[PDB]
C-alpha cells in the first residue's frame, strides 16, 4: 500500500535546531511529542522523556 503515515520530518523544532530527548525507537514513533515541551527539558545530562515517564 503506502507503508503508513510515518514521516515525522515536519518537526519545526529539529529545523530550528531544537534538542531531542528520545531514544531512536521512541523518536521513530513519537518524534513530534518528543520535542514537547521544548523548554527546560532534561539537559542534565540527557533523558528520554517518554522512557522517563514510563508507558513505553
Q: Which residues bind Zn ion (CB under 5 A)?
A: 11, 14, 23, 26, 48, 50-51
- Range 12-47 burial, b when 16+ CB lie within 10 A, else e: eebeeeeebbbeeebbeebbeebbeeeeebeeeeee
Least distance to Zn ion, CB of residue 35, Å: 5
Q: Is 3 or 18 the residue whose CB approaches Zn ion more closely?
A: 18
Q: Which of 1, 5 has the CB closer to Zn ion? A: 5
In whole angstroms, how close is the CB of 18 to Zn ion at the nearest point? 7
What does the block give as the cell for 7? 514521516
Amino acid at each position: 500500500g503506502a507503508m503508513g503515515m510515518r514521516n515525522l520530518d515536519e518537526c519545526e523544532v529539529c529545523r530550528d535546531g531544537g534538542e531531542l530527548f528520545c531514544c531512536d525507537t521512541c523518536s521513530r514513533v513519537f518524534h513530534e511529542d518528543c520535542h514537547i515541551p521544548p523548554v527546560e527539558a532534561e539537559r542534565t545530562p540527557w533523558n528520554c522523556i517518554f522512557c522517563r515517564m514510563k508507558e513505553s
